[PDB]
Subunit: 458 residues, 4 copies
């Protein structure tokens, strides 16, 4: 069986929805059983995120009806351009019903001045709940029968932890397999699940790709297709190297090491379940359906495969004599960053144990600076002597499964970096010699990636 | 003001105590103000540890009586060999006799009750230095200079009550010692020990004597701290591994810090810190080779790579995670789990995928770590750590040097060399201060690597 | 003068107008605090829960229409078209606020302690303006406020808010310099950020007192449907006469948990600054009434019906074994109120009394604290259901030899066996426990002998 | 089988030890199986307490040598008085010396290290009983019966690890003593102490020598437990207060416990519990009047049995705003006094619950005041703290008081007539005890009055 995910851009308008359905229908004639996972229409989640704060703060009753008319029109148009007056009618009722529902809650949070995380998750869920019926209708508007379902209905049962729910148990087989055994293409809302007692929950960032992975995992599928707006994964950002090419084949392991925080396509949560059961992931371009795309797979003669970059980040060094194991000073650093919700991109601590270096995003520096002040306070008194911060810095990451055991490669990567005129500020390579991460000045980003790419990829 | 510290081997016998007395006297002629810091005679601190546990466990007074006879002899012979003057010789003997009597009662005490609390554990170890110092002080008086012996607490080291590894609370070194110096007196301070508000003796821990010298120096604003040992300064690497290893003439505070790995021989970060803060140079000298120029640890001039440190037989732990990102404080909980369980972590690296953390610990701590980790998480549908892996029989090399900062090419040159040596790099950690590069290779390739590395970057 | 009016005192529009003339009569010599109408606060509670559980669209609509015509007819028979106008809308607005808040909880399905308190306040905000109205109608100037506007600053603790600051004179004085009577909706207070809080049961009295405290007022009047504090419950003894003068400390000792007229919290502020409290009947304003202020032996006899007597027996229960601490610890959680405590010189057992609907609650609590001589440190607990508390009260008893002897002999002669005795160090109150069968004969005898 | 307990005064000298041995011997003609629980000789436990304290503080070696000289001279004197036989005298002296040497060691130890752990504190205390035990065992031997001295733990009393006042964990009493009793051997067990699971000596606390007898009796299903003291049973009321005070011939388990205020001489609640549980009778007898009939605590049972008194005590009133049951206000009062270990003699709370009234020993007032404020108008919630220090507790005990209408009235009128004002009353559900407090000066005329009207 084939599970097929599409995101917000791919279902950006009625036209694109109709095009998605065409893609779906085409695959259905090659594969009997097809489950489609669908995101909210582009820029709907965000519209939803802000009215939620709009209702809580400014609290205007009309500003809500103003938002309602907007979603109404946005999706009314999609129905007109995706779909047959017959199907147009049934879908229009589903849409009206969800919109009535949506209005109420917003009116409620306005009236009370209260937006609990439970309420917050209910709002966001409407995005995908208004997308899926329109797609389902379009599938139906061609050859195949199709129904739309919520993540709960689909068998994704979660925590009570709203906004970022953990999945307890998958009941994917029980709900979908009967519907598949009957010919139906179920179109499942991505990004959302339910709790035992019926409450609607969201799955955080990368959620739709995650739902695709869970469904794929539960049904023990033959393949999971992540349909996006680029032709798979490139060897490096084409905005930096114009001659970059699609990677035909990636190992889960390699895909994992490329799936950094804030990456557009790859995420560890989507990859891990597919890796566990050995299910292939295929990244495809809905705007270029014929492209071979990137296959993330189990089997695997290259050394370096890809070069990922994280631009505009900051470098934080924590100085402190002692800082030696007899004191859980590291434990306290990360707690102070744990609270305050500061994401640590790289950690590096050398032999002396007198300092640890970290890279965070440049909007988190001051956030994490006051955090470390609150935990420690700044010889005869405390244990952090000094903190250092380097702004406008960047993380380059060289990835390839063939790097493991390959004597000499680090030497080559770094000699190259130097040959391009870049000074290495920090290096971090973990025990699975599959990823070498390092830090250089932003000025040198462009010339350094050009060289590495020229030397190691092409 | 010159602080001069002497360890166990430099004061390991009477002859030796007299030798370090002449060194102290010789510097007293160039520099008017000298404070000395001395450890117990070699083997003594160890001997005191064994008798403690023995008195607790077997509980035999005859063995205590025996131990006292060993201690008395050793120190009597020392006096008889350090000091020519009979009148001085009797003053020191007097002091020693007090301490033996006091030490005996504690030991008989612990045998009788079968209770060895940390407090008593510290009071006992204390006797090591409280028996050396008066002899060194005697040998100095014997040579013509005014001198008396003091305990660390008596000299201004006021500490926490955390016996065994006490933290320093107040530094009152200027209050006690300066009046002594002004009279022309060489105070000799028992290194490694402090005191508490109520006057309970405490110990400072591993490298305590060195720490005492640093505290005196910091407290006084000494012109120089001199650490006298049995080797001629800091070497470019372990001479056992490279026979043609040379003494580093000059070293920076950061370099020294970066060379002072946990469990190191001469350098410790506790010691280097106070000196760094007030900009007091540190000089490491050889007591048995007092002509060597040794290693000056000062402010900062050319050199890329200065030294290579090594850490034999450690272990590499990789923790593969479910997400392990900035929304789930997994890193916080890892280091907390190993904090409790008292597990010291030598290296850390986390790559940009944020999906794994690699750390190296000591190979006796592996089992402690795995148990500790399994306690905090307990190993798709179950927990937040996917799996943990371990590599035994590995080692850490660190290349250290201030000139490496901004030295485009050096990291490339180092790792290519390592590779040329016939070695695969298992993990890299280099920090924002481009002064140290640490990596991990198999124990198999330690010797070959350090040889090649030293030949190409030092000599 | 701070006159307080309650639920049944403002029961209908007539009642409100009757109340309105009373205040007008007071003003001739020289601040009025008001509660809500009868069974209105009890209704808001049920509609709150209604709108949380069933959250029914039709079942809410009928509620506001109820309190529409409840208050619409209250305007009819309480109030000239000068003043009838500025209540209709002045209450329609407050209703559509309540309706929106109510439909607010109906849509979201979440009732915070904050939302509850905001809902509960409406009761008083629906009653107050109407009274303010009939004060104007009778030719006297009047304004209707709100606890917070009057300066009752409270905790963040919704339902039972601890008072933190008082802006007494600072908000009320200028209105008094104008001839306006401030008609203040009591029971409710505020946060520093304007969020309405409630004070708990016996709150409208507290509010009245708090006004008195900060102003250092001349008098505090509590207007109810009984002619003051009686010598005993008149429903049991028909010969029960009213108490004219009651000591501060005496009124406190006559106030048990769940009592009607008196309240220790409300008594407290008045006892501090030394402000008299008068209680008078609204159905008979001519009556003398009880005056709580700063002779004779026994003053009054209070009674608590339908209680239970737990007895905790354990060998040990001494000093180092702090199970006394744990009995109450278990009873503190599970929200169990203890009426009486006794422990003899042996320290082996402790006797308590609680409402006889708390036993199973209190037992389970005790069992989840001790494993119930080689096991736990408590041997056994025993209970006596259908039992009652009688308390004799008088400051004249303090240092008066004989009264206790005589009291218990009087009890004896009524045919009653005493199960438990507790007398505090102040000697103002004597409290003992007897079978329920005996309560009627016992109180009558006691009152027959020591009051009349 | 019979267990027989003797206290410090009853073995206050060697002659008295022989006298006890004579008592134990006489009893062994009647009952074939007797076990004896013995305390330390009079004044020895006290001597041990202040010396082990002394060794901690002054750390004076010479003052230890005096204590041993003292203890040795006391017990050698005792041995020579109690025993006639030279060979027994010889073997008892050898025991006593080995024990005293052990004592010296530990006392030296505490002085040398300046440390007195609760564990060591217990080991030292255990010596008093370990020194008197073998003298008495020897004394029985000299009179013709087979006997061994045993430590409480060797007898099967296994306890906590909470030194100084341990709780019992298991009884191996039957396993240890039954093979001895089947051979005419009189085990004399050191009262007051027991062992830890890993063989560490622990003490049982105040009244712990009586409790030993009880634990033995429980563990052996004894037929009779005998507490031998220096008074002919338990009196109706303190003899020092009423001259013509008679011995109470019989007492119930429940009456016995109401008479046992924390500090009482003979009766202790913890001692009564086991005997109550298995229905084993307790007989209290007079070692200096062996012909008395004493007081029997028992099952099988006109109105008021006894008047109990607690002298020179104090009472505290806790006035507060609201102080309702809704909040955990009462809990915190007792937690506060739980820490700093303050014993509450009486508690009282009226229907107002605005105040609570407790009684504590007068030498705890400040020790209770400070700790209360350290736990805690509009600022706090506890308003006042009144206090007296010129008071006592009187408690009238009788089983036949329950359901006896009018007795409380009769009692408080009697108090009233004697010339005393009642400051507080407390009566429990089990109407076996009415406790109350009056001015100290009134105790004499009050107790005398109560005794007149309600005893004979
Ligand atoms: C994110 C991806 O799945 C989607 N097609 C998009 O680009 O919006
Ligand atoms: C600093 C060192 O790691 C690197 N070779 C550089 O200078 O760029
Ligand atoms: C450690 C050093 O200072 C000492 N002299 C030694 O050789 O032991
Ligand atoms: C660095 C590491 O990835 C590789 N095995 C090397 O030694 O070059
Ligand atoms: C509370 C009281 O004042 C009111 N009149 C009532 O009886 O309801
Ligand atoms: C005196 C005494 O009998 C009574 N209880 C009193 O009021 O003090
Ligand atoms: C037990 C007896 O010897 C002791 N004198 C007492 O009366 O308590």
């Amino acid at each position: 069986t084939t599970v097929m995910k599409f995101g917000g851009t791919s279902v950006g308008s009625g036209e694109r929805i109709r095009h998605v359905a065409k893609i779906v229908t085409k695959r259905k004639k090659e594969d009997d059983d097809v489950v489609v996972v669908v995101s909210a229409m582009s820029e709907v989640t965000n519209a939803l995120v802000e009215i939620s704060q709009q209702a809580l703060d400014v609290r205007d009753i009309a500003k809500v009806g103003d938002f309602i008319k907007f979603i109404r029109e946005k999706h009314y148009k999609a129905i007109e351009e995706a779909i047959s007056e017959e199907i147009k009618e049934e879908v229009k009722k589903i849409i009206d019903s969800r919109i009535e529902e949506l209005e109420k809650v917003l009116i409620g949070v306005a009236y009370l001045g209260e937006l609990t995380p439970k309420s917050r998750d209910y709002i966001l869920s409407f995005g995908e709940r208004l997308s899926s019926p329109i797609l389902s209708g379009a599938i139906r508007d061609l050859g195949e029968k199709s129904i739309a379902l919520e993540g709960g209905e689909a068998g994704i049962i979660t925590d009570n932890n709203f906004g970022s729910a953990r999945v307890k148990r998958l009941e994917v087989k029980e709900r979908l397999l009967p519907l598949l055994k009957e010919g139906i293409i179920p179109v499942v809302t991505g990004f959302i699940g339910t709790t035992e007692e019926g409450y609607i929950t969201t799955l955080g960032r990368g959620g739709s790709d995650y739902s695709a992975a869970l469904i794929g995992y539960g049904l023990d599928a033959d393949i999971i297709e992540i349909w996006t707006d680029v032709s798979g994964v490139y060897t490096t950002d084409p905005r930096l190297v114009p001659t970059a090419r699609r990677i035909p084949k990636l190992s889960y392991i390699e895909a994992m090491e490329l799936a950094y925080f804030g990456a557009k396509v790859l995420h560890p949560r989507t990859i891990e379940p597919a890796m566990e059961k050995g299910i292939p992931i295929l990244v495809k371009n809905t705007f270029e359906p014929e492209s071979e795309g990137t296959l993330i797979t189990n089997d695997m003669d290259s050394i370096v495969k890809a070069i990922s970059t994280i631009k505009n980040v900051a470098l934080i060094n924590i100085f402190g004599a002692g800082m030696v194991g007899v004191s859980g000073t590291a434990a306290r650093i990360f707690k102070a960053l744990g609270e305050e919700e500061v994401n640590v991109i790289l950690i590096s601590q050398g032999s002396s144990e007198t300092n640890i270096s970290l890279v965070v995003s440049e909007e988190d520096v001051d956030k994490a600076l006051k955090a470390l002040k609150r935990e420690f306070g700044d010889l005869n008194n405390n244990l952090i002597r000094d903190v250092s911060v380097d702004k406008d810095v960047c993380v380059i990451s060289v990835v390839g499964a063939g790097m493991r055991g390959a004597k000499g490669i680090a030497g080559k990567i770094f000699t190259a970096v130097s040959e391009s005129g870049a000074n290495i500020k920090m290096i971090a390579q973990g025990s699975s010699e599959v990823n070498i991460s390092f830090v250089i000045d932003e000025k040198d980003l462009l010339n350094c990636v050009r060289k590495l790419h020229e030397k190691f990829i092409e």
